[PDB]
């Protein structure tokens, strides 16, 4: 394994961009050589226009494909570009054919496009129109569709592709040849070449065959590679079949079978390919174990980590401690065949329902034939469409089952894949197709509405039911499957949809606007309600980073979502407000064409989820510059994952761990992380473990952010100020004021002024953004302070253990010291101490005596003090005992410092600023609305939020010591300093023992 | 189109961004020029330091400790501040290897050169080879340390949710800007939105830029060339000393 991610890329592309080019020179120069030279005569290019509609048929049809393989192979090499072992494997799973199916795929659109474009009828026997292209692109995907079978069965790069190749595309051309001119002219010159190049390429499939004979690796007893052959082969001769008929025959008709055969057999043909090619492909090879193989080896390696500290711990805390101081498969089939029931009963009790209480108590009932031309013609695409994805589906699920028959132990993984998630793809597509076959030929009726305005708004019934009952689907899968929920939890939301979508029918019933406005107004009710609860359910979810392997994909997922959804309610308006804005046949189009984005969307997000590890079980599954804020803090391995594990997925993050962690410790990590997740537990304990435990689970809420990047600043909710009840009452009064000028009409005599605007306006701006630079500097001060602590304990340490001779009472020192930091860390939040963070460092009965005192930092520094006078008495210290006395002092002006930054600013510089600026916001709606009306309301609510957030940012800001996330991380500091001087207590004892 | 342009949702809003903007950008300079204060007072505090012991005691296995090992303590916080590990090629002519390889397998290193420092000068003071000039020496090791804690305090972050503020309205004016410009103009709005979005973007990376002072980017300070000097200057004057002392 030596590949990289830029040679397989290029390699696609210049492959695809060959077929391109030789796919459209082809046409070009049979365009330019057939009208002026030989006896070529040209066809009327207009006539017949029937014959196009099918055409742009296969043409969607067929785009449908491209969309899914570019979407899905994009999702796989986004989600693991962060590990290199999973790339290589993806990237050899698909080693050439992705360029080549995407070139296909292009060329076949392109031409069934051109057939629209009208560019010539070259057709010239009678009558038998045909077009050229074809031709050409059915040259190019011969050609391809031969190139990957012998590259894929055989690994004959050069040798066979050669004359094969040669042969397919000169016995093309010259059955173009042989066509272009009339069957008598020049039948014999080419058409019999034509069927003996055939039985040569032929020979050659069989020579190879009979040359390399075995079975594809990923299938078992699967009669698959020869199957697959003889069904093209086999249909290859019934294409030749149907070229040698269409013109000797005049009974079978070529206007429209003719011009239909082609379409079917080609689309047919490629999908049958393709599908075989997917289902070889989602089978696991050998790769994955080569990675499960090396992802265990590093959990052992871990442990190994951990049993070596343990032992260092033990031997060293000794030291300084001691001397001087068939049924599972069956149902998993059944819950899936109960559910589809489920649905299409629903379905089938709506559609039966509806008219009975529409047109029966309903005004504008009936349209007689709404519009034939139109409508139909956008309507029969929708159900090809899904036709198409159904049988798709269908087969790769048939193939997977076939190659996984004899053996009985792998087809319930398979079978464990499948469920709680097919059953509904089956039951949305069936009843799309129905409702848009329905539509195209209408068995059902359609109502208009008349309104005060305008009355031709048209109006669809079905539409909406499945809308409803489909919506509840993808609910129902994309609340379950993606994240991990019960039933119980999903009620409300399928309760809700079903309800707006209801409200909006009621609604578009009746565009009277006497009664119109409320059904729309609870739908948009429900349907946010409903986001809300989505958006919850996301960010409260337990596993975030399975399976899509740390990325930020499900969030943007959940936003498109969304966005959908909301465009579909816009167009809603935008139509049934100003009829004059919508054509109203270009709104059916886009109703249809979005209905079909979104379910293709969706499926092939579920197709690429359901190929993912915590699917498939294999060693696990479902059961530049520095910153930071403590550059001296630096962890261990064990440390880290032990914290990850303890908690809860996604409370740790990547800058988080590259501020506590060294340079070539997290290299190594990341190193041995390239395989997997690495989840483990040794269930390793120390006296240690405790105290770091303690801290970092305290310290970790607070927020780290790599302020280069933009986005995780703008998308960013967690850390975001908190409003007031200000807002609403200001949207209140806008509200009320934009209804009561219209109801009122033009008698409102606004009257803006600009002295009572401009003058507010820049006032109080002055005022709040002086009150945050205000903060931001006490911020800064309380940060100082907590560096000046411990930079001066640490001298203090030192110049204790290095100037006294003594052993006992530079224990008692140091380790009252961290007693003291400890101790301010909850002078500020007025609590007491828990002894679990001074264990290995002090006495209980020491403990008990400090939380038995009102303020500790005095206790501790009186003790201290006394200890080092019983020092200087005996003679046990040097001449240098003023600088010990002088770093004493020092300590306890940054404690003070810390305590003054605790006062509030005072009370009538804040009341002034906050009532004026209630006064100016309640004031703005009744000078906008002289010129705007809605956006005047959007404007303000905007505005509003800028000004309350700057305010309530200043709050948070003006004291650094709490519980918030933008507060300062105090208990990361003490953990840092209890490290330096217990390591510096051994560095003294070893240095004296010698 | 019905632009119905309004004074309140532009002037407002750009008188805010911009004194926000502007500020952000003065609060970020200061921390700049902090930076260079601590450096420049570390360097004259090491070479007082330096001077002081050279004149102050007579023996000379101490001195060269302690000089040398002073070196070292510029040129690892040079390494503090970066999250790396020593190059042996920085440390040539001034320690032996043996001391080197001590030093890279410590996690602080500044606490072990200090630590080193103070044991040793411990050392001196009890076997009388030190004039009464001690509590000096012990006072600019002192001050050394608090400049260090300064330049480590520059590297902290502003707060969340001070940036996201400003960042996300600054997005919305811009957004905004044409649909109330494109009634009287062309092809101009577009080109005053484009200037008129650089200048408050390059503002706001230029801020980010200067916050943290030390790294590798073209605008920050050059950490390399202070270790060379003050590496001169103790050589040399080491050999001051040698000949004063042999004569
Ligand atoms: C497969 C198609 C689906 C799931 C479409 C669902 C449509 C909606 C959720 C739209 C709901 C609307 C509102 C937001 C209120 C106004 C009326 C609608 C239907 C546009």
Redesign the pocket.
């Known amino acids: 394994s030596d590949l990289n991610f830029a040679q397989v890329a290029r390699d696609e592309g210049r492959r695809c961009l060959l077929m391109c080019v030789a796919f459209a020179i082809a046409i070009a120069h049979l365009y330019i050589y057939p009208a002026l030279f030989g006896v070529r005569i040209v066809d009327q290019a207009e006539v017949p226009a029937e014959e196009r509609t099918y055409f742009h048929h296969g043409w969607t049809a067929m785009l449908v494909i491209f969309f899914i393989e570019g979407v899905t192979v994009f999702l796989k090499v986004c989600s693991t570009r962060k590990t290199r072992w999973l790339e290589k494997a993806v990237l050899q799973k698909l080693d050439g054919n992705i360029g080549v199916l995407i070139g296909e795929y292009i060329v076949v659109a392109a031409t069934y496009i051109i057939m629209g474009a009208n560019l010539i009828p070259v057709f010239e026997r009678s009558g038998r129109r045909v077009y050229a292209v074809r031709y050409m692109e059915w040259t190019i995907d011969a050609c391809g569709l031969v190139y990957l079978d012998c590259r894929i069965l055989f690994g004959m790069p050069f040798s066979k592709f050669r004359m094969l190749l040669v042969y397919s595309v000169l016995y093309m051309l010259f059955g173009l040849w042989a066509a272009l001119a009339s069957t008598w002219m020049w039948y014999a010159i080419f058409l019999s070449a034509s069927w003996f190049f055939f039985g040569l390429v032929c020979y050659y499939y069989w020579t190879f065959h009979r040359q390399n004979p075995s079975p594809l690796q990923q299938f078992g007893r699967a009669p698959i590679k020869q199957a697959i052959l003889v069904f093209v082969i086999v249909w290859w001769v019934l294409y030749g079949v149907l070229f040698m008929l269409c013109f000797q025959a005049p009974d079978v008709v070529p206007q429209w079978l003719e011009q239909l055969l082609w379409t079917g057999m080609d689309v047919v043909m490629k999908l049958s390919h393709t599908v075989v090619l997917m289902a070889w492909r989602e089978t696991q090879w050998e790769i994955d174990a080569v990675v499960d193989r090396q992802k265990v080896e590093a959990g052992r390696a871990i442990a190994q980590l951990d049993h070596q500290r343990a032992i260092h711990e033990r031997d060293l805390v000794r030291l300084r401690s001691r001397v001087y101081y068939f049924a599972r498969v069956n149902k998993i089939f059944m819950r899936e065949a109960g559910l589809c029931l489920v649905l299409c009963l629903a379905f089938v009790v709506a559609l039966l329902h509806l008219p009975v209480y529409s047109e029966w108590f309903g005004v504008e009932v009936l349209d007689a034939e709404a519009v034939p031309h139109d409508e139909l013609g956008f309507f029969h695409h929708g159900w090809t469409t899904m036709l198409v994805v159904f049988l798709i589906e269908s087969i790769t699920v048939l193939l997977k089952v076939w190659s996984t028959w004899h053996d009985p132990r792998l087809a319930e993984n398979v079978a464990q894949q499948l469920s709680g998630n097919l059953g509904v793809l089956i039951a949305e597509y069936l009843v799309?197709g129905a409702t848009y076959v329905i539509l195209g030929y209408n068995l059902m009726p359609v109502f208009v509405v008349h309104r005060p305005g305008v009355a031709s708004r048209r109006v669809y019934a079905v539409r909406?039911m499945?809308?409803?009952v489909?919506?509840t689907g993808?609910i129902w899968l994309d609340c379950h499957c993606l994240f991990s929920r019960n039933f119980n939890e999903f009620r409300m939301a399928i309760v809700w949809?079903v309800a707006?979508?209801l409200?909006?029918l009621w609604?578009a019933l009746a565009s009277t606007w006497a009664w119109y406005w409320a059904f729309?107004l609870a739908?948009?009710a429900a349907?946010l309600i409903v986001c809300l609860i989505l958006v919850r359910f996301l960010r409260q979810d337990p596993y975030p980073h399975q399976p899509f392997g740390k990325t930020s994909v499900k969030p943007c997922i959940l936003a498109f979502i969304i966005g959908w959804?909301?465009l579909?309610?816009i167009?809603?308006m935008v139509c049934f407000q100003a009829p004059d804005a919508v054509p109203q046949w270009l709104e059916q189009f886009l109703w249809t064409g979005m209905?079909v984005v979104?379910?293709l969307s969706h499926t092939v997000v579920l197709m690429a989820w359901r190929t993912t590890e915590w699917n498939v079980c294999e060693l696990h599954g479902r059961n530049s510059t520095n910153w930071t804020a403590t550059p001296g803090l630096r962890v261990d391995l064990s440390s880290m994952v032990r914290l990850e594990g303890q908690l809860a997925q996604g409370l740790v993050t990547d800058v988080h761990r590259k501020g506590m962690m060294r340079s070539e410790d997290l290299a190594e990590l990341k190193r041995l992380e390239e395989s997997g997740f690495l989840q483990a537990q040794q269930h390793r304990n120390w006296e240690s473990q405790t105290r770091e435990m303690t801290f970092l689970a305290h310290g970790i809420n607070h927020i780290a952010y790599d302020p280069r990047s933009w986005m995780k600043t703008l998308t960013a909710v967690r850390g975001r100020a908190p409003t007031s009840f200000l807002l609403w009452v200001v949207l209140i009064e806008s509200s009320i004021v934009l209804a009561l000028s219209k109801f009122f009409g033009e008698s409102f005599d606004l009257g803006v002024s600009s002295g009572i605007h401009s003058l507010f306006g820049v006032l109080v701006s002055f005022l709040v953004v002086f009150r945050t630079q205000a903060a931001f500097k006490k911020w800064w001060s309380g940060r100082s302070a907590v560096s000046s602590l411990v930079q001066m304990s640490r001298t203090f340490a030192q110049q204790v253990c290095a100037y006294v001779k003594d052993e006992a009472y530079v224990n008692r020192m140091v380790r009252y010291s961290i007693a003291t930091v400890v101790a301010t860390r909850c002078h500020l939040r007025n609590t007491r101490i828990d002894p679990a963070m001074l264990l290995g460092v002090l006495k209980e009965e020491e403990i008990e005596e400090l939380n038995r005192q009102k303020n500790l930092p005095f206790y501790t520094a009186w003790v201290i003090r006394s200890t080092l006078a019983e020092a200087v008495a005996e003679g046990a210290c040097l001449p240098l005992h003023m600088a010990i006395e002088n770093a004493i002092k020092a300590i306890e002006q940054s404690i003070a410092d810390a305590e003054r930054l605790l006062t509030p600013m005072p009370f009538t510089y804040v009341v002034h600023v906050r009532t004026f600026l209630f006064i100016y916001l309640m004031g703005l709606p009744f000078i906008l609305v002289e010129d705007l009306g809605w956006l005047m309301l959007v404007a303000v609510s905007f505005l509003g939020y800028l000004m309350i957030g700057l305010e309530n940012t200043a709050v948070q800001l003006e004291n650094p010591f709490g519980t918030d996330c933008n507060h300062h991380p105090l208990d990361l500091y003490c953990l840092e300093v209890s490290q330096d001087l217990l390591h510096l207590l051994d560095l003294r004892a070893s240095a004296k023992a010698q």
């Open positions: 799309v909406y499945e809308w409803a489909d919506a993808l949809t707006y979508m409200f909006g609604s729309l739908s948009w349907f959804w909301v579909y309610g167009l809603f209905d979104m379910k």
